[PDB]
Short mmCIF file of C-alpha atoms in Angstrom, two decimals:
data_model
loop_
_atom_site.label_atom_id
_atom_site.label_comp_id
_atom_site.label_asym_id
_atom_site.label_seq_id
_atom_site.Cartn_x
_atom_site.Cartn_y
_atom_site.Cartn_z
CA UNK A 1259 85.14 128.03 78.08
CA UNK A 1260 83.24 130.36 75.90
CA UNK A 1261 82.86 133.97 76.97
CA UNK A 1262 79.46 134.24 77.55
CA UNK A 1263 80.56 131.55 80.41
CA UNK A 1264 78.66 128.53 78.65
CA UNK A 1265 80.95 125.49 77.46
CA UNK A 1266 80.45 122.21 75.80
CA UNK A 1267 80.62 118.97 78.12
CA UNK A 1268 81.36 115.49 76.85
CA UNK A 1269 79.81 112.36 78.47
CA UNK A 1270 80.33 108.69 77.13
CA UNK A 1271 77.09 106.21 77.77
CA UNK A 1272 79.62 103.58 78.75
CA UNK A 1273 76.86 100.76 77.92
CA UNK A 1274 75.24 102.37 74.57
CA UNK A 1275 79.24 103.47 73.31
CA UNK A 1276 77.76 106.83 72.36
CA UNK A 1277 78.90 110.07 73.05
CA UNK A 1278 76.52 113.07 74.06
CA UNK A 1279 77.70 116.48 74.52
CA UNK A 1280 75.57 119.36 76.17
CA UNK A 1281 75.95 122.77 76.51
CA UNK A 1282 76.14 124.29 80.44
CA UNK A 1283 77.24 126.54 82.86
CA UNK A 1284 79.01 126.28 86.15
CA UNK A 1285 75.68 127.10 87.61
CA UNK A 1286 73.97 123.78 85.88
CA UNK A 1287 73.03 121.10 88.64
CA UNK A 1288 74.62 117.19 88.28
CA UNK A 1289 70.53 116.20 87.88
CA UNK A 1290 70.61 118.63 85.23
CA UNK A 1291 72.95 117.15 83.27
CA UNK A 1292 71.36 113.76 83.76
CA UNK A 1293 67.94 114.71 82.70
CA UNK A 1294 69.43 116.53 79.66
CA UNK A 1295 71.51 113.57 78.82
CA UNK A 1296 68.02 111.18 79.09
CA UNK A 1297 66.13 113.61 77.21
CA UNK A 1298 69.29 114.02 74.45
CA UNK A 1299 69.83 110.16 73.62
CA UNK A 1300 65.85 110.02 73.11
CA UNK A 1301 65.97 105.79 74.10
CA UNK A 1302 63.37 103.75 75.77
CA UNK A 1303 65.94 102.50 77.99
CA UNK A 1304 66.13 101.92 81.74
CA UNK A 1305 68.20 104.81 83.07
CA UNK A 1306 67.84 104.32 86.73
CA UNK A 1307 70.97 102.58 87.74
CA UNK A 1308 73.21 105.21 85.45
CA UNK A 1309 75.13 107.51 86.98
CA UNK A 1310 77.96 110.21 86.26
CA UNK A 1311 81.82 108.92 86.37
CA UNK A 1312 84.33 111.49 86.20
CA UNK A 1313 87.96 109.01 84.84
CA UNK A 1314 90.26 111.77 85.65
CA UNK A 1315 89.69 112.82 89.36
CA UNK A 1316 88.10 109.08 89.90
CA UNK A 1317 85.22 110.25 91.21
CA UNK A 1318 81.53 109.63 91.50
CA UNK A 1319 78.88 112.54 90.93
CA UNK A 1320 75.71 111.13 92.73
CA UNK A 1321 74.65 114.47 94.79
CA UNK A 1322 72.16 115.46 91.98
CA UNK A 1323 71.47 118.91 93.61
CA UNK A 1324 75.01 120.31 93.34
CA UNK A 1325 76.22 122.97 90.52
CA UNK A 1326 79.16 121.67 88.40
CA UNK A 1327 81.14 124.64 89.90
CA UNK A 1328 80.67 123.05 93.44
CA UNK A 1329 81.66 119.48 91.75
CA UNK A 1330 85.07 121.50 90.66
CA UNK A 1331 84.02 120.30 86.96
CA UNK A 1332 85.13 123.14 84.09
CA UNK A 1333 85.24 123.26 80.27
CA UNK A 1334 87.88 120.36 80.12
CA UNK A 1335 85.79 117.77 81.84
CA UNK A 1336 85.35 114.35 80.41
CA UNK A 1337 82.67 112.64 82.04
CA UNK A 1338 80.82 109.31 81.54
CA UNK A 1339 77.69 108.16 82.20
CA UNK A 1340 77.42 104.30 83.07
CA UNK A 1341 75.18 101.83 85.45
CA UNK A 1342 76.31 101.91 89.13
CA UNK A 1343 75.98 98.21 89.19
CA UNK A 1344 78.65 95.80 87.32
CA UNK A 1345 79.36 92.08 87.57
CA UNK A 1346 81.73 90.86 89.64
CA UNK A 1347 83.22 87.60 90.55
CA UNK A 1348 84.54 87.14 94.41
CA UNK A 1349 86.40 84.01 94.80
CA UNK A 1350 85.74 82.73 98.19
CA UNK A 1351 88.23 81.32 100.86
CA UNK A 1352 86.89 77.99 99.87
CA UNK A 1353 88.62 78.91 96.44
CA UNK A 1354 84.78 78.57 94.71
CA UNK A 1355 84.10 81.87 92.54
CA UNK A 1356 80.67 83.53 93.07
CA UNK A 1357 79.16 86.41 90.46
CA UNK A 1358 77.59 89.44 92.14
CA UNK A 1359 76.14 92.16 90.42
CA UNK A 1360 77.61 94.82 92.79
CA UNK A 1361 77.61 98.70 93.43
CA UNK A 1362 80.42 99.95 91.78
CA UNK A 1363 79.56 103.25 93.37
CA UNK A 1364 79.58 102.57 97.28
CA UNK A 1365 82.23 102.28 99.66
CA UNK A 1366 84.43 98.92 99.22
CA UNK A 1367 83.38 98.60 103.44
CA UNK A 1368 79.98 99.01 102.46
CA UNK A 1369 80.21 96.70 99.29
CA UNK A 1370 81.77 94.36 101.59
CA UNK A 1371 78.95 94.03 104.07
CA UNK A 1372 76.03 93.87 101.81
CA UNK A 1373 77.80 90.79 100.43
CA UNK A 1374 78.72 89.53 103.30
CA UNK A 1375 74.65 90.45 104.60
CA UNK A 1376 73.25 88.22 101.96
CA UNK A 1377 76.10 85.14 102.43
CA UNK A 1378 75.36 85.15 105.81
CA UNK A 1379 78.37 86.32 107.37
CA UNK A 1380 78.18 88.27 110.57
CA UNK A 1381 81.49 90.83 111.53
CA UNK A 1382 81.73 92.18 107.82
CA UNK A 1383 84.62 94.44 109.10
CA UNK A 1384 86.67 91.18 109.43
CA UNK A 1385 86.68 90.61 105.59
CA UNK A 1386 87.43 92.68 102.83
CA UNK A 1387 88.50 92.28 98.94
CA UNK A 1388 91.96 91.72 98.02
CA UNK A 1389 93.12 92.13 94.41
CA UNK A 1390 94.92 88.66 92.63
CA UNK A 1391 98.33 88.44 91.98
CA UNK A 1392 81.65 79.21 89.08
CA UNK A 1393 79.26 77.97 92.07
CA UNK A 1394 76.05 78.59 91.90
CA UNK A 1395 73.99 79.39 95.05
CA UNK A 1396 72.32 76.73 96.76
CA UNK A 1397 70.59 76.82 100.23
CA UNK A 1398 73.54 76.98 102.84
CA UNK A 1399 75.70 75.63 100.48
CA UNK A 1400 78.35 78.20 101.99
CA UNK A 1401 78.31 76.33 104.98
CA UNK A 1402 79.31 73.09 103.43
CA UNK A 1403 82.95 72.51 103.21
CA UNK A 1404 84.74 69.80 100.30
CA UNK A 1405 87.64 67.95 99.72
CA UNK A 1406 90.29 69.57 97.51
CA UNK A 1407 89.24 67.92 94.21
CA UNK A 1408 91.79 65.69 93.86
CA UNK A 1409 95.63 65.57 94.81
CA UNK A 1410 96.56 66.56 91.46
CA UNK A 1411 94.77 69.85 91.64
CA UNK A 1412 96.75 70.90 95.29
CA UNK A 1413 99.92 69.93 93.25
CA UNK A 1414 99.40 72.14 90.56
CA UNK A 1415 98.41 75.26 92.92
CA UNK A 1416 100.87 74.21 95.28
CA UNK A 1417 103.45 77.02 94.28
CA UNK A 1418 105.49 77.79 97.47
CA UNK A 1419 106.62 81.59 97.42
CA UNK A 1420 109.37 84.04 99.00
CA UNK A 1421 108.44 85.71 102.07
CA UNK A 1422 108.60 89.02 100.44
CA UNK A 1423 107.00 88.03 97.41
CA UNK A 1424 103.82 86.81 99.75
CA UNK A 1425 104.37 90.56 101.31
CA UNK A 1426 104.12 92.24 98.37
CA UNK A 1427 100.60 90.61 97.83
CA UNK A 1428 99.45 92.78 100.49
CA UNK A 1429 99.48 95.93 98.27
CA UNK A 1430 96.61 94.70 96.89
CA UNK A 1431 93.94 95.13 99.29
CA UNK A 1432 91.18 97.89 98.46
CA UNK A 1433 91.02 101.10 100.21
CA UNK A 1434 87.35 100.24 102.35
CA UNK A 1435 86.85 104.09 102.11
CA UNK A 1436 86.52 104.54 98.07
CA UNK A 1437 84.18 102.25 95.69
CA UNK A 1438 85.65 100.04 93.35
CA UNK A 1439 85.03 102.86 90.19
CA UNK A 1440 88.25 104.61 91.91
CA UNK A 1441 90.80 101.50 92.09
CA UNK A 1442 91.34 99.90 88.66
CA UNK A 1443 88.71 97.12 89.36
CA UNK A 1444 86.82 96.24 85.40
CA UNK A 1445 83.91 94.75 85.53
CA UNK A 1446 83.54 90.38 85.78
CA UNK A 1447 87.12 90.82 87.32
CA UNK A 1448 87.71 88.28 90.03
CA UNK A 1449 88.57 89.33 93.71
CA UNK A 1450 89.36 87.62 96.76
CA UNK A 1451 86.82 88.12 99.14
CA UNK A 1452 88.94 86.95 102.52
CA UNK A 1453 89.44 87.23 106.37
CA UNK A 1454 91.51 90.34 106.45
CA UNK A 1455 91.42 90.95 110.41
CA UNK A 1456 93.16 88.08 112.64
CA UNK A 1457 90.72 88.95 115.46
CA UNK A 1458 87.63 87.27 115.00
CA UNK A 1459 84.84 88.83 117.27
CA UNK A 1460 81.99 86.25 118.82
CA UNK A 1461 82.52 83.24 116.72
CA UNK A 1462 79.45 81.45 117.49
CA UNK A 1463 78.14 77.88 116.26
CA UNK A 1464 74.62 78.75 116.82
CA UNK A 1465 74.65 81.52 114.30
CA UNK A 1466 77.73 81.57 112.36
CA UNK A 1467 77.99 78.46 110.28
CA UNK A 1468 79.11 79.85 107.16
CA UNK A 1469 81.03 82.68 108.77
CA UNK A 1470 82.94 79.44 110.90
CA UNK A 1471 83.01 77.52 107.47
CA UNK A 1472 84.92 80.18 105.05
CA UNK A 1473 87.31 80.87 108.17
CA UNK A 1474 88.28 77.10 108.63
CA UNK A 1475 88.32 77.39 104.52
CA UNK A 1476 90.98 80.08 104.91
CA UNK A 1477 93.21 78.45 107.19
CA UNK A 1478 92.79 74.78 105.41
CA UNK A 1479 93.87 76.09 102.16
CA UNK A 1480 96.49 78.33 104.18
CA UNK A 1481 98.07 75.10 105.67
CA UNK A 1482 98.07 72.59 102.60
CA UNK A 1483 99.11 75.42 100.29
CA UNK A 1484 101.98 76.25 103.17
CA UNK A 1485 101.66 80.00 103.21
CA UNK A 1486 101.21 79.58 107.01
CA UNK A 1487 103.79 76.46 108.32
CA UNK A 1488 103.45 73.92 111.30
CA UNK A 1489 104.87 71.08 112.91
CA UNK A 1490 104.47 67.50 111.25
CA UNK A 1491 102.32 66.66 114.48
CA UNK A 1492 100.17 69.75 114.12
CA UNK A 1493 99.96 68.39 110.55
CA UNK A 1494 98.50 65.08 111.17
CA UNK A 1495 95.92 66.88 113.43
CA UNK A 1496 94.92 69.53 110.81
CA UNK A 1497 94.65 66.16 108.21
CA UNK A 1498 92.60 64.34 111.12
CA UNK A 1499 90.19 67.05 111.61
CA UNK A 1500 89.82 67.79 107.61
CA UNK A 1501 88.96 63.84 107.58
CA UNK A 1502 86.43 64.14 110.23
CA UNK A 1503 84.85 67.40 108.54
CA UNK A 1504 84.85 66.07 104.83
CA UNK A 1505 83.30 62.64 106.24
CA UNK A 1506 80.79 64.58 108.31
CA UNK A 1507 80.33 66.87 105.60
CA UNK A 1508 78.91 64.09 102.88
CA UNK A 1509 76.90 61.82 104.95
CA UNK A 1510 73.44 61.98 104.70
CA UNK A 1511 71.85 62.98 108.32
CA UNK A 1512 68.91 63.49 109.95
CA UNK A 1513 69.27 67.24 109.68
CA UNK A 1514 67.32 69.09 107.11
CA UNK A 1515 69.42 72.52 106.88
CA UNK A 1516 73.21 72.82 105.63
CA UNK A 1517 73.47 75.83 107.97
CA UNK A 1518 73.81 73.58 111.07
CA UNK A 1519 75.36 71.44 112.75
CA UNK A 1520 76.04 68.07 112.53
CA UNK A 1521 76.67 65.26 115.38
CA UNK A 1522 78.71 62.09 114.61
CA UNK A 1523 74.96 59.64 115.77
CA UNK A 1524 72.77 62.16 113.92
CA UNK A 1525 74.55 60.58 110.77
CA UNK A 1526 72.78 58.10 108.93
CA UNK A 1527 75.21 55.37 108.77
CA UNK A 1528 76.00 55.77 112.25
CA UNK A 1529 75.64 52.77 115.18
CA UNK A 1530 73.74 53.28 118.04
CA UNK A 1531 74.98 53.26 121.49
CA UNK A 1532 74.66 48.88 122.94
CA UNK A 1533 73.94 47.56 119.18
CA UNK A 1534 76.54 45.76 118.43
CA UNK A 1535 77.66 44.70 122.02
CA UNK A 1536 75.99 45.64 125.07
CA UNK A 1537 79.71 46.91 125.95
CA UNK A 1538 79.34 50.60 124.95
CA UNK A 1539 81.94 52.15 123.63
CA UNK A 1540 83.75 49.00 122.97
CA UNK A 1541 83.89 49.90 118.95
CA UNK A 1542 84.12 53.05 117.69
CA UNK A 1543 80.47 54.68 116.56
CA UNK A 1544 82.13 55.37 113.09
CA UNK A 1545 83.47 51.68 112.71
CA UNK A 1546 85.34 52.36 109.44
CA UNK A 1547 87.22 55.23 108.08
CA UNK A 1548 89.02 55.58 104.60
CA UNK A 1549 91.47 57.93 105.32
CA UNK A 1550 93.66 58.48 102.67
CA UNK A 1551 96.36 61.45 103.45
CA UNK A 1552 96.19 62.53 99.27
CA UNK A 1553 93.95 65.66 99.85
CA UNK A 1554 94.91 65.85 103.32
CA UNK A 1555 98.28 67.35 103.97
CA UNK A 1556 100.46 69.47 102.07
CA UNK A 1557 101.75 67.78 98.98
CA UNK A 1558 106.06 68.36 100.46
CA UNK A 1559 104.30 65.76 102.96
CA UNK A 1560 104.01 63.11 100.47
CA UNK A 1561 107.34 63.88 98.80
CA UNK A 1562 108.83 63.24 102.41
CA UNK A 1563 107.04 60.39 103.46
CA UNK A 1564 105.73 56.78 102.11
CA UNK A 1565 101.54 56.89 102.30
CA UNK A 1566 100.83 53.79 104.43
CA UNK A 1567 103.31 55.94 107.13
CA UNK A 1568 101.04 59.31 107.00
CA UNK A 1569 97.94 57.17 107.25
CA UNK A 1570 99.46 55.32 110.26
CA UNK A 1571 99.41 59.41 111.78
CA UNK A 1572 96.34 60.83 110.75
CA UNK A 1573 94.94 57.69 111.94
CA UNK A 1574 96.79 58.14 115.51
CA UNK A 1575 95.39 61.77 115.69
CA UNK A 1576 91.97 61.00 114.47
CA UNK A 1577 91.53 58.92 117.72
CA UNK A 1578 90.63 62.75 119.33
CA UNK A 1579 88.67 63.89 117.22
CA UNK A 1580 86.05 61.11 115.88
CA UNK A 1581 83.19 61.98 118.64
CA UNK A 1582 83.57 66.28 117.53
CA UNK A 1583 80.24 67.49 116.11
CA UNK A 1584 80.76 68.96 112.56
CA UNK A 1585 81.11 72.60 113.63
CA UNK A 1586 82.90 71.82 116.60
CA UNK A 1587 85.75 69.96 114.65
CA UNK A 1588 86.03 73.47 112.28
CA UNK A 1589 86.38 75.48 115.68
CA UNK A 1590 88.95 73.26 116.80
CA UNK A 1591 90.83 73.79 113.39
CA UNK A 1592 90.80 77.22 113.45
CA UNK A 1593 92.12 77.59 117.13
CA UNK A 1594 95.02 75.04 116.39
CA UNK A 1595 95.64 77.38 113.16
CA UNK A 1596 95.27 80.56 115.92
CA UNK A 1597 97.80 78.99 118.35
CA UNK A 1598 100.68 78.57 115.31
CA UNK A 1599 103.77 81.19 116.00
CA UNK A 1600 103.16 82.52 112.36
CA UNK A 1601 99.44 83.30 112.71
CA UNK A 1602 97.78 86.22 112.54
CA UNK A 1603 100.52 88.46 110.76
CA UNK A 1604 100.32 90.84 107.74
CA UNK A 1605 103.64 91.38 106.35
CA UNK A 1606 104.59 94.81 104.12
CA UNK A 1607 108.01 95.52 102.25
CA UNK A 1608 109.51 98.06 104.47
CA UNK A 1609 112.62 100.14 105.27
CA UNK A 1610 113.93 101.20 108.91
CA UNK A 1611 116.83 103.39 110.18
CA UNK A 1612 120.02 101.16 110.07
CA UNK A 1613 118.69 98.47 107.10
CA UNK A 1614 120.89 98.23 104.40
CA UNK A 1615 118.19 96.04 102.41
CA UNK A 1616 114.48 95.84 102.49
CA UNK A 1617 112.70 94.48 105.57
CA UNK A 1618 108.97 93.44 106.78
CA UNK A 1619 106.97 95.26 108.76
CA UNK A 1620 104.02 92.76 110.57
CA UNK A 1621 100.95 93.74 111.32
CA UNK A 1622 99.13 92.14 113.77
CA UNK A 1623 95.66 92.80 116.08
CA UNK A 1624 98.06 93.67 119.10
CA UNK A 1625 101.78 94.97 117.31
CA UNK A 1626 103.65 96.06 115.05
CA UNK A 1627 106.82 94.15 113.89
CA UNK A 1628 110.16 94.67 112.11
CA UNK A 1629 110.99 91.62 110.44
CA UNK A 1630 114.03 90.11 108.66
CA UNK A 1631 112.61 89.61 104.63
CA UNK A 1632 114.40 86.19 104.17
CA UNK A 1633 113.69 84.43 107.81
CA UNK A 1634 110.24 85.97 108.65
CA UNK A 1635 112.03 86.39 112.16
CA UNK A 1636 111.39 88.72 114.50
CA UNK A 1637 114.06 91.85 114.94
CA UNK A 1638 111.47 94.26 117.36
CA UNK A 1639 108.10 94.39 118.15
CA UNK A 1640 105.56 97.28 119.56
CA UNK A 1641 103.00 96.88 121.16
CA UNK A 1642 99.41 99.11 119.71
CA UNK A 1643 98.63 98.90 123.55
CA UNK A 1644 101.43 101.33 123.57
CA UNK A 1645 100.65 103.81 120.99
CA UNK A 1646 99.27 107.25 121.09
CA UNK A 1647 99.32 108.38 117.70
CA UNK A 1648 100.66 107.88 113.97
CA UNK A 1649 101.73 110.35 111.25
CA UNK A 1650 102.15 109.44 107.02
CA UNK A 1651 104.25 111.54 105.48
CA UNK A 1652 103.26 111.24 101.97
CA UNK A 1653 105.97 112.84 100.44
CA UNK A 1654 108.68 110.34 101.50
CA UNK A 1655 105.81 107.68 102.31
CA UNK A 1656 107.16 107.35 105.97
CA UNK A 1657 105.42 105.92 108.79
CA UNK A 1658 105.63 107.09 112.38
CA UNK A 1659 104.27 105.87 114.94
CA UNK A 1660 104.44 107.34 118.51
CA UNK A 1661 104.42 105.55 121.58
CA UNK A 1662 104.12 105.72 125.60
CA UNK A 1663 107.60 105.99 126.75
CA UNK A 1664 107.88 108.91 123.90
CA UNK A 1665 109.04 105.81 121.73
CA UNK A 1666 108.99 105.96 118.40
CA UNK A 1667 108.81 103.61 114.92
CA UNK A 1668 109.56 104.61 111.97
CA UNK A 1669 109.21 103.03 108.41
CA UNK A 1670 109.57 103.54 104.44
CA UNK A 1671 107.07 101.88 101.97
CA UNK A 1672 105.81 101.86 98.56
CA UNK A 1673 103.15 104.66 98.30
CA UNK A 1674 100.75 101.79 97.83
CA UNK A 1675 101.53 100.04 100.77
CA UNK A 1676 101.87 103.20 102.90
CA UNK A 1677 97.78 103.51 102.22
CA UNK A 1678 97.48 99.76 102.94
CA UNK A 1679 99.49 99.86 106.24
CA UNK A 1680 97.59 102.92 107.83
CA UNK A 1681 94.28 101.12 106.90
CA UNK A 1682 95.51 98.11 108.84
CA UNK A 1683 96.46 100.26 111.61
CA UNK A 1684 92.77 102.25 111.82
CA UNK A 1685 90.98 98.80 111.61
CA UNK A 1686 92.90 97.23 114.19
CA UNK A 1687 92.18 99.88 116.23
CA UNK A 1688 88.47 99.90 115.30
CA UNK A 1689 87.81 96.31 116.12
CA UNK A 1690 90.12 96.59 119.45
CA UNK A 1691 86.17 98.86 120.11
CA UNK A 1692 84.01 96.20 119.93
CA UNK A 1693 84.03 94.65 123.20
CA UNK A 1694 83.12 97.70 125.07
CA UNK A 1695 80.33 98.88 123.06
CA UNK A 1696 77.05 99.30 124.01
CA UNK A 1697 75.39 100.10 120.56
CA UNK A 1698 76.05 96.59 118.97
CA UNK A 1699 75.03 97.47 115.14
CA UNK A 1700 77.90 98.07 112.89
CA UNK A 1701 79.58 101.51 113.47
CA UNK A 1702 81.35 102.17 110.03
CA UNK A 1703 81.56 106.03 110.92
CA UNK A 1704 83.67 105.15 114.05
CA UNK A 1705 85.87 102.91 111.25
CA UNK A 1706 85.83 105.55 108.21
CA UNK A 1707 87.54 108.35 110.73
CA UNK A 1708 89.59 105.80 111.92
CA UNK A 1709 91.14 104.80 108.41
CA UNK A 1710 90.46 107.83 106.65
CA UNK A 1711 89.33 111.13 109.17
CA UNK A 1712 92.95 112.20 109.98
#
């Protein structure tokens, strides 16, 4: 900071690895900096998409018209200048990865729904990206479910985990209110673009085949991988219904579009009603299955259990669900998922008056839980119905929430998962609106002051 009030700012062309350094003044605008930066480097290059990154404060300077003094930026200010769009790779719930070219500038709850605008997935605020632990677009093709590749495959990603090591997954969902610039996210990284939200608002066949196809993905690979558990007869459903949706899935039909449905006698193999017998419904209209429970169940299933047994049971359950359309058998696989005592909960490493050890606390659309970290059982629950308020205290990264009957919870996290948690909470809350409202486009104000307006 010189005293004629003029000092030297660095900025680093993230894509050219050069470094520029201009002269200025509080008083210089952001656009001035840009157009002396352009006018510096002296390159026929494309400069549109740049913009200036400030690494330090993680922040974006977009608003061209402001002063640097109005940005907060002084003589010690290390700035870069870099393309707003980067490459990223979003593995789907069908576990396929997908490359976007992304901006790394806007809002992860905006980034969110443009992708989810141009996969064709209707209730963006359902989804978001989640930080781990190539297909190529064809038309529909998002729609169209597959069989796990082969049984080998689900054995080798079959890796079974701790409760509170699947918990402590859940610190790595992005904050929807800050671009992925401000949370450690490189470009080409891979992120899980997933069903966040366990309510799902409007799931309708006639619009929503993809959206219906990645959440049947979800809870298939959720079942065989068994991060979500069931009974052995819910199990031989789930592996009837995969059958019926993989078979469906292959045959060639009538049907020109992959974003549609698809009836059992649209299929081309199928038998028409009185051609074999004039007794209808005498033989089955698919008269031969291969069911073969490999790819079907999880793989502690075939561990357990001889083959020609399981086949015996998927066969047995499969009895109920040959005549389902295509879409209609992926409904009825998500709503047996829905109805399983596990479903629908978000678990957080958490500490609560009296614990001598670390405990859960759930998350669900409708309550909030405090759960034992070996067990997954349920100590207490509270219902959001309930609550009035919550407060964060940073400093101690406690979370209390206040409830009708002046009751109270109160819980200790991880910094990280105190941001996470109070998200969770907000966008509960902001898709409890949707029922009631009378506007009907996507209100992400109503949602940004109700995970980050305080």
């Amino acid at each position: 900071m010189g005293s004629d009030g003029t000092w030297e700012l660095s900025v680093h062309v993230t894509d050219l690895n050069r470094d520029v350094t201009l002269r200025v003044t509080g008083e210089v605008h952001i656009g001035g900096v840009m157009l002396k930066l352009v006018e510096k480097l002296d390159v026929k290059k494309d400069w549109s998409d740049h913009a200036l990154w400030w690494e330090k404060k993680r922040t974006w300077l977009l608003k061209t018209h402001w002063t640097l003094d109005k940005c907060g930026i002084q003589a010690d200010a290390k700035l870069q200048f870099t393309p707003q769009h980067k490459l990223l790779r979003l593995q789907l719930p069908n576990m396929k990865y997908v490359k976007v070219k992304v901006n790394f500038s806007d809002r992860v709850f905006k980034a969110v729904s443009d992708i989810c605008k141009t996969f064709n997935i209707r209730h963006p605020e359902e989804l978001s990206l989640l930080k781990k632990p190539a297909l190529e677009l064809e038309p529909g093709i998002l729609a169209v479910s597959q069989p796990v590749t082969s049984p080998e495959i689900l054995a080798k990603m079959f890796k079974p985990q701790a409760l509170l090591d699947k918990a402590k997954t859940n610190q790595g969902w992005l904050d929807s209110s800050r671009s992925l610039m401000e949370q450690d996210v490189k470009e080409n990284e891979a992120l899980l673009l997933r069903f966040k939200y366990y309510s799902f608002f409007d799931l309708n066949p006639k619009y929503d085949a993809i959206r219906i196809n990645q959440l049947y993905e979800q809870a298939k690979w959720a079942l065989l991988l068994e991060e979500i558990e069931c009974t052995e007869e819910e199990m031989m459903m789930f592996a009837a219904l995969q059958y019926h949706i993989n078979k469906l899935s292959i045959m060639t039909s009538e049907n020109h579009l992959n974003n549609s449905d698809k009836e059992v006698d649209e299929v081309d193999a199928a038998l028409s009603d009185l051609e074999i017998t004039l007794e209808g419904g005498k033989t089955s209209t698919i008269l031969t299955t291969d069911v073969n429970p490999e790819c079907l169940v999880s793989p502690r299933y075939l561990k357990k259990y001889k083959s020609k047994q399981i086949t015996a049971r998927i066969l047995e359950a499969h009895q109920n669900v040959a005549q389902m359309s295509l879409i209609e058998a992926k409904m009825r696989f998500i709503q047996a998922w829905q109805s399983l005592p596990e479903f629908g909960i978000t678990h957080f490493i958490a500490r609560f008056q009296g614990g001598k050890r670390e405990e859960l606390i759930g998350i669900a659309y409708n309550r909030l839980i405090r759960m034992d970290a070996s067990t997954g059982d349920a100590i207490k629950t509270w219902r959001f119905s309930n609550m009035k308020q919550w407060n964060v205290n940073w400093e101690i990264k406690m979370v209390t929430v206040e409830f009708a009957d002046e009751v109270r919870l109160s819980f200790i996290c991880t910094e990280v998962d105190c941001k996470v948690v109070h998200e969770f909470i907000g966008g509960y809350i902001f898709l409890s609106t949707r029922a009631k409202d009378q506007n009907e486009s996507l209100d992400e104000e109503m949602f940004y002051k109700l995970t980050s307006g305080w």
